[PDB]
Nucleic acid binder design. Structure first.
Lengths: 145, 124, 209, 63
RNA sequence: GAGCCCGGUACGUGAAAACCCGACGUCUGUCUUGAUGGUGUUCCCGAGUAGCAGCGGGCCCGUGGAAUCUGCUGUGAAUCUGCCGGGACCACCCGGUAAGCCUGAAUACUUCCCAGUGACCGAUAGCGGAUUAGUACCGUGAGGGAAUGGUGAAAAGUACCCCGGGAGGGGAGUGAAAGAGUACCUGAAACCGUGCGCUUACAAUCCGUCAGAGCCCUCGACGUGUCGUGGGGUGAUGGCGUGCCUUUUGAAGAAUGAGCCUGCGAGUCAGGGACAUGUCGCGAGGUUAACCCGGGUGGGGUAGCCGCAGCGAAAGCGAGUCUGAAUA
RNA sequence: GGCGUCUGGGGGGAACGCGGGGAAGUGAAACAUCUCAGUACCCGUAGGAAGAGAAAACAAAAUGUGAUUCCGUGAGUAGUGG
């Protein structure tokens, strides 16, 4: 029978806070800050280098743009298909997300990484070159939406 | 959870003040000035405990050399004899024999004289 | 599966219940129970405590005297932290202490707390505390004494059960709680658990599905 | 409050597959008639940032 | 230190009158001198408005390729194959029908009133204000702006006598206590005395420290006083000995600060923030936010976020990808 | 314009609303663009709440949403910036 006084935190969980500026025995009179200067009083900003042109301002900006209309697919490898469906059967997008292979609302593309040995009729929005072969050569059909 | 620092702080004030009794002037009444003394007082002691060993060894040499010269032998020769003779009484008891019971010390001196070389300045 | 013998106020056994091995046989996890019961206490603690900083004290908006020449310390206000009556520099502010504990952690704490009671034979089930439609704590006290002799006890009573709840309210150590509102801290605080047959089934049916 | 990613560092550095930090080289914008092709050829492409400034850069990009 | 002594609590009961919410009617207005579905043309659909131009404002957008919204000055159209939006613009398609007006609920707040709560303060705290409080006081004025809580269960607050002009005190009384006497709970430290023990008027002293004669007190055993695995207080005399903190290459420093005591006075909090490191849950999965249901800390909540494939400026390709004429 | 007569205003209020006017210290390790900030303050106004509101709206080829307001996400991202 356990009561509220038998409950102890796991060893190593709770660690005592290091009080600072509380006597010269532990951390005294300077609190780890050393003597006078800028860093003694307040702080120094991260992006500041003493006047010299910072590393983030003397390097050319990265090239290109983003193409807001980029269509980014969710990829599942044929190797994962084999593991999740040993028997085979039909596997649409809903069947994949039921096994947690791809995100629920994404645009699935099937990529041919692993080895497929099962009769499976996949259905995904796109297929890589090797995914077509792996599906077909293993006696399966790959119909895309 | 506001905490009044009376109980926690008064503890160390009693220790220093009680331990600084017998001091002259302010060094016996005020905690600030008494603590300044306790820093010196406990530094002087730790230095004097080490120096006491050297001081007391000294007083013994002065008593040995005084009695050794009363028996017509210098101290440095008396020690050279005793070390050679196989007597390993330290200086504390040698000074004790010299003061309390002089009869034994004369016996010790005669032992030291015998074990000394024939010509102490020989290059041996 | 633990068979809990059901009792009645007349002293006649009615039937038995089968505590599932999932809910009532988990190995207790002390480090997990401690985190949970600390989380509920922190949510209980209300952070109503505040002090006025140097900025929120009434007045002290003028440099009391000159910078130079006076011969006293340089002072910038009559309410600075070092003054008497000045502001509080690092004081308490009203804050909330509730912390987000995952659902799986919280539930598993309750199962461990309940499983502990079942092992040591502390879980009791009762059809009804007293004769219907008439509260009477003398009858309830006699019943509870018959069941368990320990000082503290926890009674899980269905929401709609009022004659039972209003009967055992006045008792010194008895705490009454709805089967939906079951929590770790209450369970651990009790020597026994006196379930209600309608409540025990409701609790079991809620999780086991 | 959230932590605002530094605008300048976000537009100059990149994260690769393993978590490396890459950057582009300087001296390639103008005044490069007299710069021989060997100089320009060695001055293009992304380079892993030096471990000297890898500490500061991670602070800028992540916060 | 009260469930059973009192006020109350659980649980019930109570409105003459006023006010507020409803509800049923008098009363008010409207439809019935009216509706339903069909065919081919002319009229209408908000004007100094829309649009354009100059100068501005504001939108992620600092005039930029600068759309939509809007102010001032000019110029100034159409009424449905009309007009405006779909980030200059043009064509096609799609949406809508400006230059007329009302609209509750979801939402923000608390001068005030009622009932509560506190791992909030407890008289230098908490409101500036537990007491004459925005009072006293300072300033012509705007304005600034304090300090002061506690006898006792009950006042039973010392009748009476003595010294004294009185104050104050001593007897005697009340009181459990007067080491509670309206200067009143507890009553510390600085500071000020009184009595006793030791020491000090030939002596150079960061005022101590280590030895240490003498005197005084104490605890034992043994006789008159004399030792001891003793304890205390003083210390004649000898040896050694340059304050504390800051800040400095370096300070006892004739560099800075502190007259003393007691109170008070400085790495804290918020955020699903960032990085790192422990511990716990689940584990190719983890988790909810807002919100809803519970007098609770519990239950629900899949919208999102992180992981799960990378390369490339991007189209794209994908265990590969980019560069490249190239398996270079 | 003058008369006579009826009804109204005027001032106060702690916070919250709406429409106007609108700084500086500060950050930029200087500084003018920029930030602080449409913040402090000022003006005119109500209400128990106010403002907004019934598409000359989003959207992107889906036979989609369907007034406004207020929370959570989107996101410290797309962008913007001596």
């Amino acid at each position: 029978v356990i009561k509220l006084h038998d409950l102890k935190p796991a060893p190593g969980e709770k660690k005592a806070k290091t009080r600072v500026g509380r006597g010269e025995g532990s951390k005294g009179k300077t609190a780890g800050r050393g003597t006078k200067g800028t860093k003694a009083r307040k702080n120094v900003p991260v992006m500041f280098e003493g006047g010299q042109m910072p590393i983030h301002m003397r390097l050319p900006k990265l090239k290109g743009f983003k193409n807001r209309f980029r269509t980014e697919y969710q990829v599942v490898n044929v190797g994962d298909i084999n593991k999740a469906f040993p028997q085979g059967g039909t596997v649409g997008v809903d069947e994949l997300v039921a096994k947690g292979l791809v995100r629920k609302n994404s645009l699935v593309k099937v990529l041919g990484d692993g080895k497929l040995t099962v009769k499976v009729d996949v259905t995904a929005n796109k297929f890589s070159g090797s995914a077509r072969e792996a599906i077909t050569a293993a006696g399966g059909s790959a119909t895309e939406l | 959870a506001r905490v009044k620092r009376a109980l926690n702080a008064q503890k160390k004030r009693r220790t220093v003040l009680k331990a600084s009794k017998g001091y002259r002037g302010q060094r016996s009444r005020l905690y600030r000035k008494a603590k300044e003394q306790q820093l010196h007082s406990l530094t002087y002691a730790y230095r004097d405990r080490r120096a006491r060993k050297g001081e007391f060894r000294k007083l013994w040499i002065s008593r040995i050399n005084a009695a050794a010269r009363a028996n017509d032998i210098t101290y440095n020769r008396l020690i050279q004899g005793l070390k050679a003779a196989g007597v390993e009484v330290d200086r504390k008891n040698l000074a004790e024999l010299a003061v309390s019971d002089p009869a034994a010390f004369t016996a010790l001196v005669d032992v030291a004289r015998a074990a000394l070389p024939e010509d102490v300045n020989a290059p041996s | 599966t633990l068979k809990v013998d059901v009792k009645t106020p007349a002293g006649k056994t009615d039937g038995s219940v089968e505590l599932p091995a999932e809910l009532f046989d988990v190995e207790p996890n002390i480090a997990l129970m401690h985190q949970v019961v600390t989380a509920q206490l922190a949510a209980k603690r209300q952070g109503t405590h505040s002090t006025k900083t140097r900025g929120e004290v009434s007045g002290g908006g003028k440099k009391p005297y000159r910078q130079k020449g006076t011969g006293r310390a340089r002072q910038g206000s009559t309410r600075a932290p070092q003054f008497t009556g000045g502001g509080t520099v690092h004081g308490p502010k009203p804050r909330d202490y509730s912390q987000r504990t995952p659902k799986k952690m919280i539930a598993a704490a309750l199962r461990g707390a309940l499983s502990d009671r079942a092992r040591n034979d502390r879980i009791h089930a009762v059809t009804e505390l007293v004769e219907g439609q008439t509260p009477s704590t003398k009858s309830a006290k006699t019943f509870l004494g018959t069941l368990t002799e320990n000082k503290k006890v926890l009674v899980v009573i269905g929401r709609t059960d009022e004659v039972g709840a209003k009967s055992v309210r006045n008792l010194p150590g008895v705490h009454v709680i709805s089967p939906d509102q079951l929590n770790t801290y209450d369970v651990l605080n009790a020597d026994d658990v006196v379930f209600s047959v309608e409540a025990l089934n409701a609790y079991i049916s809620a999780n086991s599905k | 409050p959230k932590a605002k990613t530094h605008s300048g560092a976000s537009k100059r550095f990149r994260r690769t597959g393993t978590g490396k930090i890459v950057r582009q080289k300087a001296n390639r914008r103008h005044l490069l008639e007299h710069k021989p092709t060997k100089r320009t050829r060695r001055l293009d492409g992304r380079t892993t940032v030096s471990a000297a400034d890898n500490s500061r850069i991670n602070k800028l990009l992540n916060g």
